[PDB]
Amino acid sequence: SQVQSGILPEHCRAAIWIEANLKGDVNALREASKIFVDNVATFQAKFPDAKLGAVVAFGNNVWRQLSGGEGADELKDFPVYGKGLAPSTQYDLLIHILSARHEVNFSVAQAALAAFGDAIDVKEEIHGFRWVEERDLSGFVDGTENPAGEETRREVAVIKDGVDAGGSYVFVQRWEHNLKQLNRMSVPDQEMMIGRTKDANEEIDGDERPVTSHLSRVDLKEDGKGLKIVRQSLPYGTASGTHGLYFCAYCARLYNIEQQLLSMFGDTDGKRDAMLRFTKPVTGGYYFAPSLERIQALG
Amino acid sequence: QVQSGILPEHCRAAIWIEANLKGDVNALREASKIFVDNVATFQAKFPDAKLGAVVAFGNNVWRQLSGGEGADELKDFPVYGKGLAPSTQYDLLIHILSARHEVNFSVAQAALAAFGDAIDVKEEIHGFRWVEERDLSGFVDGTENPAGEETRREVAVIKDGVDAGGSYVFVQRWEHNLKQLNRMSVPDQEMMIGRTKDANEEIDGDERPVTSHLSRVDLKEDGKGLKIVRQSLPYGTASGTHGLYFCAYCARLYNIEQQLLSMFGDTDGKRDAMLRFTKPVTGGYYFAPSLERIQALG
Ligand code: HEM
Ligand code: HEM
Ligand SMILES: [C-]#N
Ligand SMILES: [C-]#N
Ligand SMILES: [Mg+2]
Ligand SMILES: [Mg+2]
């Protein structure tokens, strides 16, 4: 019934994402997941000012085993989109921790690793940070059309009824920005690529921007109803090394996310997102975040 | 006028960049002036960040930029303990610290834009203050660090001569093995450090082993402490490499070297007990000139 604490929080400045494969028997994830959510409650009690939230989510094969094939009807392994333009790196477990304090997130990440122990093989650990003026590292404001407030975010992200009530589908994809390539583009060119102006963050009218602009690729409607998602993405990386956006989105329907990916990567109309001129996705996975009561009923 | 990153206390986050000079040493002259101007711009834009930064130079490049004048104690970081403390001496150190990691990141990008392809970045470490100002080992870090601008200036900043306003910097990245630490009982970890873990109380010098960290580094010469200004912070990922990025400033390189000779077995043949769970993997000495000296880089 109860949603996991990390799906809905807004404005968190820091996050940690851990993606891992299952090394042993899948049944090891049952007690580890219960221990971890108990650990999250302990850290929320110890650091109330952190406004800590976390999510434990599962890949298709593992979730089919843990659920006995019941529910999560849209869950599947992340496919390769655009025949390869969006790679697929589907793992078994996703742990997303977000709060106002990176140091508290770090302790929670250590608790997650202690709980799962050697049952998992960590493939990725990314430390996200909100950058100046809530900008992506490209220099464009991120966040503007993201669903706002608990009520609307719950409507978009949280499954309303049935066996999966309180759960959500998660999509994660790490992008590597080439800022030298971006800086070769004039600001008019970068704005036509995104579909919003850079300094003032004003939307460029849909009839004035290219159909390849990011907003034209992802602001999708079906008979006038927007295919909304709750984004929790953040910048990550080092200034001298790899950096970019760690894309993360929650939705009550995996469909909304998939339609945006088919659009961005050329599968819908043969055109692809103009942001591929300076950044590329290097990982990709779909996961199912059960409700807290469902995690308690894993035993 | 001292560089802004030496003296600030209680920084929440830092970025350290260590690099080698690829191009001409003269490219570091203009780049350093641009960078200190960028730091002043970021301090004006983000006053709440309490942003500071330091540009410091390795022995060979500082001898060229200074014409061999001053910085009498500067030298390439040697290995200590015949190898226990490795040496990775580079040409340039950029240290950025503040209350806001996001501001540090913009300043790091400005540093890389200023130096451009004249440098080869060897290391970039993003430090974060952990819960209760503890090191990742779980011990509080900073208790006996000089407190207040007056005392920190006395310890870190050169008082007179050509180098007035400058400071010597030492950086050393440590990689913690928390599995090895967790195999130790809390009393055994407490005798290794020389302070109690939860309460952070000093264990009397006559009660703790001479190998305890405090016994290795709380050194006195005729009753006067060999003080240093530490700016170290935890770093890393929970699943990968993590530890302490050690950073210290001192008006005399001597104080730092005496602590290293002690920790790594060169003084009395005994080594720091912390080597049971953590090890240093980089090491370098740099000279941080005063701001007036950076302006005069001609
Ligand atoms: C390099 C990676 C990406 C960057 C830099 C990026 C950047 C942005 C920016 C600057 C905006 C406009 C401000 C806003 O409304 O939040 C935006 C909007 C959006 N992005 Fe992305 N994005 C990225 C990847 C993605 C991906 C992979 C998806 C979905 C699969 C996505 C879905 C959205 C949605 C739904 C919107 C809101 C569009 C609207 O309704 O106006 N983005 N993105
Ligand atoms: C793994 C690396 C290290 C760890 C985990 C570590 C940890 C600590 C801790 C827990 C304290 C006690 C609290 C305090 O006064 O701050 C301390 C004190 C100190 N450390 Fe370290 N330290 C490390 C490396 C070093 C190094 C390389 C040096 C110098 C070369 C150093 C010099 C000091 C000094 C001067 C003190 C204050 C001692 C006193 O006057 O009581 N530390 N360190
Ligand atoms: C889009 N973020
Ligand atoms: C010691 N830090
Ligand atoms: Mg719209
Ligand atoms: Mg003492």
XYZ file of C-alpha atoms in Angstrom, chain B residues 119-296:
178
model
C 48.242 20.413 -18.230
C 47.647 16.651 -17.988
C 45.245 15.923 -15.093
C 46.509 12.886 -13.144
C 44.004 12.918 -10.311
C 40.648 14.583 -9.538
C 39.184 13.782 -6.091
C 35.856 15.033 -4.785
C 36.029 15.210 -0.940
C 32.882 15.301 1.261
C 32.584 15.860 5.008
C 30.924 12.695 6.399
C 28.355 12.398 9.233
C 29.528 13.917 12.585
C 32.754 15.095 10.812
C 34.022 11.496 11.061
C 36.594 9.836 8.847
C 35.089 6.757 7.039
C 36.792 4.602 9.709
C 34.177 6.070 12.125
C 36.623 8.241 14.138
C 36.038 11.993 14.418
C 38.639 13.878 12.266
C 39.707 17.478 13.047
C 39.599 17.728 16.886
C 43.207 18.901 17.378
C 43.372 20.747 14.068
C 44.324 24.441 14.681
C 41.099 26.447 15.221
C 40.340 30.053 14.273
C 41.897 32.255 11.571
C 44.592 33.678 13.925
C 46.046 30.298 14.963
C 45.595 28.766 11.494
C 47.433 31.755 9.952
C 50.224 31.291 12.558
C 50.596 27.599 11.645
C 50.086 27.697 7.847
C 51.136 31.094 6.481
C 54.763 32.181 5.934
C 55.350 35.415 7.961
C 58.146 37.295 6.188
C 60.601 37.447 3.315
C 59.957 36.839 -0.390
C 57.456 34.012 0.438
C 55.349 36.054 2.965
C 51.708 34.984 2.566
C 52.618 31.610 1.009
C 52.384 28.082 2.402
C 53.684 24.547 1.801
C 51.065 21.906 0.885
C 51.177 18.147 1.235
C 48.573 15.863 -0.389
C 48.299 12.079 -0.008
C 45.345 9.879 -0.951
C 44.641 6.931 1.344
C 42.611 3.832 0.413
C 40.729 2.376 3.408
C 40.008 -1.330 3.750
C 36.902 -1.136 6.006
C 36.570 -4.994 6.011
C 39.998 -5.217 7.689
C 38.997 -2.388 10.048
C 35.688 -4.110 10.957
C 37.597 -7.335 11.898
C 39.247 -5.265 14.702
C 37.471 -4.868 18.056
C 36.514 -1.232 18.933
C 39.129 -1.148 21.795
C 41.822 -2.339 19.321
C 40.779 0.375 16.798
C 40.888 2.930 19.664
C 44.517 1.929 20.561
C 45.385 2.144 16.818
C 44.166 5.790 16.612
C 44.865 6.973 20.183
C 41.317 8.351 20.777
C 38.051 6.623 21.784
C 35.687 5.970 18.879
C 32.168 7.070 19.922
C 33.114 9.803 22.456
C 36.346 10.962 20.714
C 38.357 11.291 23.941
C 42.117 11.245 23.755
C 43.756 8.138 25.238
C 46.617 9.240 27.515
C 50.024 9.100 25.743
C 51.437 6.819 28.499
C 48.477 4.336 28.059
C 48.390 3.944 24.238
C 50.990 2.201 22.017
C 53.813 4.324 20.553
C 52.510 3.105 17.107
C 49.079 4.780 17.740
C 48.348 7.501 15.183
C 48.389 10.274 17.827
C 51.748 8.997 19.171
C 53.146 9.098 15.622
C 51.907 12.610 14.674
C 51.391 14.646 17.888
C 55.088 15.633 17.925
C 56.776 18.273 20.072
C 60.262 19.785 19.916
C 61.218 21.011 23.368
C 57.517 21.243 24.312
C 56.394 23.129 21.127
C 53.991 21.191 18.896
C 54.857 20.646 15.208
C 51.427 21.895 14.120
C 49.874 21.693 10.636
C 46.530 22.915 9.193
C 44.676 19.861 7.857
C 41.990 20.189 5.139
C 41.519 16.414 4.575
C 38.215 14.864 3.623
C 36.683 11.476 2.983
C 36.184 10.493 -0.678
C 35.048 7.651 -2.884
C 32.211 5.242 -3.550
C 30.732 2.784 -1.067
C 31.255 -0.182 -3.467
C 34.609 0.906 -4.939
C 37.681 2.758 -3.708
C 37.149 4.993 -0.668
C 39.248 6.522 2.065
C 40.722 9.829 3.188
C 42.227 12.404 0.869
C 44.870 13.820 3.222
C 45.759 17.483 2.693
C 47.795 19.735 4.989
C 49.180 23.295 4.898
C 52.163 24.532 6.922
C 54.478 27.567 6.967
C 57.316 24.993 7.284
C 57.509 21.769 5.234
C 59.627 20.503 8.193
C 56.573 19.936 10.426
C 54.876 17.737 7.827
C 58.063 15.812 7.013
C 58.739 15.037 10.701
C 55.231 13.522 10.998
C 55.798 11.401 7.829
C 59.245 10.183 8.973
C 57.524 9.179 12.248
C 54.476 7.474 10.664
C 56.470 5.523 8.103
C 59.269 4.073 10.304
C 62.191 6.370 9.418
C 62.592 8.015 12.851
C 62.422 5.116 15.342
C 61.763 2.038 13.153
C 58.067 1.928 14.203
C 55.128 2.455 11.778
C 51.661 4.000 12.226
C 49.183 1.367 13.447
C 46.631 2.681 10.864
C 48.636 0.821 8.181
C 46.755 -2.316 9.496
C 43.609 -1.129 7.563
C 44.529 1.758 5.204
C 47.372 2.667 2.874
C 48.631 5.784 1.091
C 48.685 5.479 -2.732
C 49.793 9.017 -3.890
C 52.049 11.675 -2.382
C 53.243 15.152 -3.323
C 54.631 18.435 -1.937
C 53.677 21.809 -3.429
C 54.296 25.490 -2.742
C 51.248 27.799 -2.577
C 52.477 31.369 -3.289
C 50.721 34.468 -1.893
C 48.163 36.197 -4.202
C 50.569 39.193 -4.754
C 53.194 36.674 -5.954
C 50.663 35.066 -8.407
C 49.929 38.572 -9.817
C 53.675 39.143 -10.204
